[model samples]
Target: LPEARKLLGLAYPERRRLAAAVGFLTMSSVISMSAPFFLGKIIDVIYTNPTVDYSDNLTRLCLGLSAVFLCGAAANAIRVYLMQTSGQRIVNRLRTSLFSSILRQEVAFFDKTRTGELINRLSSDTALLGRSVTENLSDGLRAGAQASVGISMMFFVSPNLATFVLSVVPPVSIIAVIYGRYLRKLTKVTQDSLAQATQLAEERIGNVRTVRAFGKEMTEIEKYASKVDHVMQLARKEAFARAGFFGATGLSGNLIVLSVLYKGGLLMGSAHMTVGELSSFLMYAFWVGISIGGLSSFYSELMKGLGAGGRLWELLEREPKLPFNEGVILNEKSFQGALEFKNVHFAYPARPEVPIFQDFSLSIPSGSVTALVGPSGSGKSTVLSLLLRLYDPASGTISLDGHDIRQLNPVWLRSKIGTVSQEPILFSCSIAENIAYGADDPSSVTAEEIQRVAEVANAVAFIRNFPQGFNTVVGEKGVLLSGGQKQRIAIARALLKNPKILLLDEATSALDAENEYLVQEALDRLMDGRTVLVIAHRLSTIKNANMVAVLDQGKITEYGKHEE
Candidate 1:
């Protein structure tokens, strides 16, 4: 009952349609159950007076039954249609809500979560939960109501037959419980084995080129077959129990029917109710078995739905550690990007034992480019993350124009800083759309504005060489583009944003000399009058910075002009 309580709460938004559909569902169940009782009466009349025919009343009863059956069909159809559409609506709302909640989580949440897992919740879990709360939920209620009513009707017809049927049920149910327990273990083993087989296929298929290079096609084939061979063994193991259960249940049904006929024959020969009751009780007995199966199936389906629903509920109720939109906006004209890190201490949340920074401090003048140098993994790139306010320092402050960045809206802070890295992530969209994504409102960006930034970023020449040019769809994560081309487009995106501060980190290290020159020239163009932090180790690049900082051991070890 509590499960129903929780699931109906999930479907509260679509309650009106769901409630209407359930009403139809109830009518159909009642009409279907009553059909057998009325038909039993007709059968009794035929048996008691075989020689006499009352055609007049028989004609009216049959016609009325036809009308009732038609109504039953219509009501069931309406319920199905209503439930399906309502389920779809519930899923749509859940997907959007889950997506927004996933996005709003603090950065650390993503650090510990796998991408594929989150996607599964969005697609698979949402659909499962939605179907359970709406369609499956209605099925369960109908099954429950029908079984209860059907069982009571059987007992009403004849106590002797009802007692016999009840006697068979408990023993059959006891065997079912034993088989169910065995099946539960069997299913777990099957899932684990299937997952192993699937994992092998995914990897082998993905790494087909490597396998081909080694000319190991036959060996790979054997390996996969071997994996599936174990699955087949498990299948054979399951087949034994399944076939056994199948035969037992089948035999059990025959025994119950046979007992009903033999025992009822004796009772009717003496005197229980009448011939009418004997006919009615037989039909009612049959319905009990079917209704029991329906009720059993509903329980299993609901549990499956509950398991999926629990995962979604936890994520939905989670509170993010970081604020999304509660801080002040630094939209004032006077706030030029003069960045300062004061006695900052920090470590990634995933590995709190390893310190990335301790008492790290540095200052940059407004509208001047500065360079910071350190060995790889010495926390140079982490500086940009802190300045962008992607993560907060534990014990110190990052301020822009003398105001603490923590006091500013994180979105507003990120909007003020533009980033260009060696490998930039691009969406699966047209080149124009990817660049326009930098704007506060992407739809507001003109094509001409996009073209201007592309020219300034030195991407216009190569972008134009393609037939579709800016409209060409970049495949997932810009996989279709070359390294130099992706970097140039990233620069174009940075230029389009027109940010007050720029963080350039190993931006040209991935390119060839020719590509590097183009990207370097683009970066130079982008840094004009903006307070910039260039993370580089090259001597030639360092000469161009207005100031230099050397960082080591979680702190800035040196800070001065470009020359030592």
Candidate 2:
């Protein structure tokens, strides 16, 4: 309960707005109750003095009732406006916080978590929390106030009958409490199943080409259908439970009304209560019943929100293992880019049982190109990840210019290094924007600067061929361009950074010979005067390297000049 209270406290910053809304809502509730009071007055005037002239009194009562409704309507509109505005502001702040928290998480978190599940929490779960904090809370308050006023009027009219009506409440409350607990558990299960189904759909749709190429369309469809079926089953059970609970509530409320009618008739005949008073008392009883029912319904929704809020809180509270922007700054001009791995022992967190490296050590001097050549799964790519600080080594230290890289600000260290992977990733944006992405401040990069890097990378000619020139959208992951075109653009992006160190992981491995030649020429120009690390399967690509290291298992078995 405390945690849930803390979650709702996110709206505390907008307390003034919420308070105004509540004030308007309270006035509306009070004015609306005047209708039942006036109805009893009209009944008494007609029943007690049917032959007397009461036109003036009736006219005044009718006009007053109309004015009361108008005032209530105005208040209700203002309350809704204020409440909705406050709700939107609260949701905006929540989404911003959630997004920032997700981005600040360490890379290891992404390795274990699903992309779709995270997205659901951001989009769907936060919305549930908004309703819980805003609308549900507002409704609960209004219902409580209305019930309190109506019950007080009931007791003032006839205490004996009021006590009898209140007798039905204990069993009703008990049933709702028990039923709500079960419903809340089911709600969580249903939400989980829905998230799972959404995750599967996202994965398949994102990789639709892979599924089609493998002719696994039927298989994927069946898998998704199976998940949908599971969700449907759970939903059906939830529907039946809800129907049964409401059924019991309605039946009990009607039975209380019948008993009230029979008992009140006897009191009226015995001169203990007037006909008009009994009528007003019944209306108050109806208000109390409706308020209780509203509260029961709101309780179920609040539980669902609590379940979603709990999941969101879990993500927000987690501390990232690799903290960014909080470490020592290095002198950019004095950084020599000399790299070394000293007796490192490493394993992927996801597969700790199978070690990737054990007591592995290597060194590369400043302003030299070194090549890592080994079979697949030989930790060639792992070396690049370590340099980028994507994942720190399990033991020992990786140093740049004799300073442990771990001590350097991770963002600063990465800013000094540039990478072009085998499968380059490009955002769905203009060519100029994609190239400018490598700059320290993308908005500050000029068109001339982008063109200069493109010329050096040999990508300018083809870029100029397009009608839009540099303004052409590359499509997601550069899908609009050929493999060679994408590779050249990626090379241009890296060159634009003008980094102290360059890491190329088989930049030409996926290209045709002609494209490979073009990329290689661009790479040769980009490597000049920079500390370079190259990972390659083709011996020709490594022939010009200053040194070659052969890794077997997790350790370097051979290290020498390429010619030797």
Candidate 3:
């Protein structure tokens, strides 16, 4: 009851809607309880007088019963509608808020949190909350009210008998309370295990190619099965706890019924009570017993709802690591694209002391081609990440056009920088849509513009060869395209953006000599006016750069103008 009570407070924000729903539920419960009470009264009246003028009274009682039944039917219908609609609304709000918060998080946040786990939170967890709120909440409320009203009626029927019956209630309630606490904990553990299992399954399926290539399918399956076993064991324990509670409550209710009947028979036989009154009293006692039994079942549901509600609340309260201030503005209409990293130091939040960039400094003038040449772990990618402001430096500052990027709006900062990564990402959409992904107005960028950008990136010839031309649907991540083709399409997308600054991260590294020659020509054309930063591994590819910087261990080891 306490869990349900607290949930009511949380539900108060939607009180006007839920209150209307609760009112209908209450009406339904009252009508349902009145059915038994009216029947009992009718029995007493028929048995006692047996011959009194009963035509008019009988008609009135029948009409009253019909009215009660009609009210109950109407209330039940309204209750069903409200519960479903309100539950859907609440779940929708929670899921939308969760996803929006996740989207606002920095790149570091995604590095730690798996996509599958976030999906589970948005889809599965919220679905569970919806179920508990809709069905369990309403059922628990009705059961609780029925038990209370039924017990009160029993006391009115026969106080001494009611007292005897209620003596068993405290112990029954105590046992239920004890088992309920254990079940709540077990339910949480079970739900967590299920979420982990779902995450593991999703990962295995999502990376099926890697798993198959590495011959690790059985290993993944066994690991997932182990988690399944653990979750199953926890579920069994939870079920046992609920079953034990039910058994205890049911036994106590039957014992109370037996005790009352035995004592009641003696009073009836001794002429202290009429048989009709005794029959009515016994009927009321049974109603109380059954109502309590119903509550025992509902108590378990309430426990689960409270646990899920608390979990949902915890997720709702989590604040993202990076806060984008809405009022922050980047007022410059155009930037010079002159970039400088001045004594910049950075590390991931999780590994803060292990710096990725240690007092790194570099300057590239506007409209210059500067190649960043480095070994594998020499922080080449880290430089690109810093430029993108995926994270702010722990110390020092990065500036664009002499303005600190930290003060600029993150969205605005990204809009001016075009990027082509080693592993290009394409959506499951037509080639034209993929090319125009970063356009300010997607619709305004027409087929001709798409073809123009593609031609400049050496992708138009292959795109035109496709059966559907620009209308060809590229599969997820461009699985339909060759690796070099995907890279060319990515370059086309970046070129179409027409950005002030461009980043090319080993874009030609995966291609053969012929494709590289074609793409390199297109790259040269795309970088004609923009400030270009090229992260390359081969010296030959950077021969035309205005300058080159060699990095080692997160520090620039050499800086010079390209001799060629």
Candidate 4:
């Protein structure tokens, strides 16, 4: 609870608005109390003075009551509006901070964490916290105030009856406290189950093509259904717990009301209590009971919100293993793109028992093409990842232009290198936008520059052949285009950056002979005057390389000209 408060405290602007909302809520509560008192007076006037003509007095009371209700309605509307607006602003800042934190973490974080779980925290969990901050907070405050005033009025009207009603409260409160704790535990489990279900759905939908190809639609459906069924079971338990809590509260309230009615009748028969006073006390008692019930339900909701907040807070407080936002800024112009890996020993964070690289060393001189040829498990892809500083070496230094990459700002280091992998990834956006993604300032990239890169990549001919040209949507991961077309567009994207270094990870390995021939011609132009490191499976691709490095068992076994 304290941690959740601390988070809310950071939103100083929202806090101030919350204060104002509370003020209006208090005003509304005070005005609303008048309604029951006026009703009691009207009842007494009609019954106690039946012969007297009280039309004028009744008209005045109705007018005054109407005005009070209208004012209270206006205040409540303003309070609700202010609270909702502040809630949205608070959530806006929270979601942005959470997303930014996630993005800044090292690539290894994504390897360990599920994307669907993160999305759940970003969307559903934050929404729960927002409700706690706005609607639940307001409801709790208003209910507390109403209960306080109602109970005080009950005692003021008749102390004897108030004492009896208050006796039932302590036991009711104990039940609520115990049940609320149980409900909170159930809420956390329900949230986790929901996240698991969401994860399954996302994985299946995102890879629907693979699922359909494998004829596993029914299998996937069963897997997803199992997760959903678990969530439904938890939800059913929560609903039962909730129903029991409300049932106890309502039953206790009714019993108290019956006791009060009997006691008040006896007092009236003895001429110890007036009929109007008993009526007013009954209304006050009902108000107190309703307030207590409202508060109990709100307490359960607050607990759920706190649980959600705790999960979110964990992410925000975590310090990423590889810090990228703060570091030395590298000068892009001065970077000569000379790359060296010195005795680097490394293993993936997830599986430290199996090493990918040990005592490994390699070098690529400026303005030269160095081809890396290796078998599947020879750490070729790991080499590209290390160069990008996606993960640090277990022990040793990777240098760019004689400067340790660890000291260089990751953003600047990546900006100077352009990559075209075998499987190119494109967003569900226009072709121009996907190509412009290579630019430092995407919005500022000119059409002429885009066209120049496309022409160089041999993509302009195919791209212009489409009716929409550059405006054509690529579909998710460029599924709409053929493998060769996607590679060319990817090459165009890399070329648009005009990088100091180029990393090609089997760039043309997936293309057909005709497309590979066209792509190779384009690569020849793009590789000129750039420091290029190519990973190739076929020996034919690297015959003209300045140097070739063959890796085996995480070590560079051979290095020299292609003939050697």
Question: What global local distance difference test value does model 3 have?
Answer: 0.79
Work out the TM-score per prediction: 0.88, 0.86, 0.78, 0.85
Give a tens-digit lDDT track for model 4, residues 1-564: 587666567457687788988899888788778767777777777888779988887799789878977887888888889989888987898899899889878889998999999999999988888878788888988888899999899988888888877786678778778988988888889999999889889998999999999999999899988889889999999889889888986787677678889999899899878788788888888888789878988999888988898888888887889967666765657678999999999999888899999899999899999999888777898998999999999998999998999988889889889987878888899999999999999899999999999999999999999989999988675439887788888899988888989998875447788888888888778888899999976677689899999999998999998888
Task: Give model 2's TM-score versus the native structure.
Answer: 0.86
Candidate 1 ranges with C-alpha deviation above 4 Å: 1-6, 49-66, 186-245, 271-279, 331-334, 477-479
Q: What TM value does model 4 have? A: 0.85
Best-fitting candidate, measured by TM-score? 1
Write down the worst ten-residue block by lDDT for model 3.
323-332
Give lDDT for model 4: 0.86
Please state the error at residue 517 of candidate 3 in Å.
4.7
Write out the backbone clash pairs for model 3. Answer: none
List the candidate 3 regions with Cα displacement exceeding 4 Å. Answer: 1-14, 45-71, 124-137, 172-254, 271-334, 461-480, 507-509, 512-518, 562-564
What Cα-based lDDT does every candidate model obtain? 0.85, 0.86, 0.79, 0.86
Q: After superposition, how far is residue 156 of candidate 3 from its true place, in Å?
A: 1.2
Q: Give lDDT tens digits, candidate 1, residues 1-564.
A: 776677877899888889999999888887678866777787787878889978988799789878987887888888888899999998998898898888988889998999999999999999999998887888778878888878888887777789988898799879878987897787778779989989988998999999899999899889989988998899888878888887887888788788888898888888766677777888877777677778788788788889888888778878888888779886578588899999999999899889999999999888888899887789998898888777889999999988998888889889989998767887899999999988888899999999999999999998888889999889585438877788888899989898989998865456788888888788889988798999975677789788889889999999887766
**lDDT for 552 (candidate 4):** 95
